[PDB]
Amino acid sequence: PMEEEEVETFAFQAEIAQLMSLIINTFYSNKEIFLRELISNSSDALDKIRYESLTDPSKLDSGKELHINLIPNKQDRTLTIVDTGIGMTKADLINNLGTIAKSGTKAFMEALQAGADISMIGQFGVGFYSAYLVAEKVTVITKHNDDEQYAWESSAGGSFTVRTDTGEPMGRGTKVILHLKEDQTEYLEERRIKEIVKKHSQFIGYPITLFVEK
Ligand SMILES: C[C@@H]1C[C@H]2O[C@@H]2/C=C\C=C\C(=O)Cc2c(Cl)c(O)cc(O)c2C(=O)O1
Numbered sequence: 001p002m003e004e005e006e007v008e009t010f011a012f013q014a015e016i017a018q019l020m021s022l023i024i025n026t027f028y029s030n031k032e033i034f035l036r037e038l039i040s041n042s043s044d045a046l047d048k049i050r051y052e053s054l055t056d057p058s059k060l061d062s063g064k065e066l067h068i069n070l071i072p073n074k075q076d077r078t079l080t081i082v083d084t085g086i087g088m089t090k091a092d093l094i095n096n097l098g099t100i101a102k103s104g105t106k107a108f109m110e111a112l113q114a115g116a117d118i119s120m121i122g123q124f125g126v127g128f129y130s131a132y133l134v135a136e137k138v139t140v141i142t143k144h145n146d147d148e149q150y151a152w153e154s155s156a157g158g159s160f161t162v163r164t165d166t167g168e169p170m171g172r173g174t175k176v177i178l179h180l181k182e183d184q185t186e187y188l189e190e191r192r193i194k195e196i197v198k199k200h201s202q203f204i205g206y207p208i209t210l211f212v213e214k
Helices: 014-025 032-053 090-096 106-114 120-122 126-135 182-188 190-200
Strands: 009-010 070-072 078-083 135-143 150-154 159-164 175-182 208-210
Touching: 014 106, 014 126, 032 070, 032 078, 032 120, 032 126, 032 175, 032 190, 070 182, 070 190, 090 135, 090 150, 090 159, 106 120, 120 126, 120 159, 126 135, 175 182, 182 190
Parallel strands: 070 208
Antiparallel strands: 009 159, 070 078, 078 175, 135 150, 135 175, 150 159
């Protein structure tokens, strides 16, 4: 028999949609910083579970290992960044990834148009959206101790979907799946990934592991 699944489609907040259009429809050099930004977000999420767990070690019942895995797949043309940080409840997810104005959007767009390097994006708290420098679609899978596992996705166009996830369960954390644009396949190459992690993400305080396909 036919199966059913519930999907929730949301509109990006207006300024977030404009920031996405700017990122997507305009050339920036130095696109490589997308990875620094996502690793930074993972490192922060790992910090939040680590410190919470000091007071309450049962918060690590869903996994003690606090790390980041990078998983390129040339067949799928995806680069996946997995963390075991605090994760997001559904409400956290819709709050952090698009429905709520972010304090730094306006300010960041005026800087970028004014000629700022895209590299400045992390400082304005909208670093996630640098994913769209290199990805035509982003999927974000998340699991928080207080909620079920959810899948977020967007190909921009002003909207994103949320659903309960029917893929692999994770114990806790967030997985960002970048569906790369056809001209951005260098970010699936192990040499390039290592180069950019060395250059931008050296002082991250959790182990990071690159899985190379043989
Ligand atoms: C909300 C939680 C915890 C916050 O500390 C992280 C800081 C910024 C995160 C912003 C996001 O939008 C969600 C997020 C992204 Cl994008 C990511 O790439 C990796 C992650 O682990 C999280 C996450 O789960 O973030």
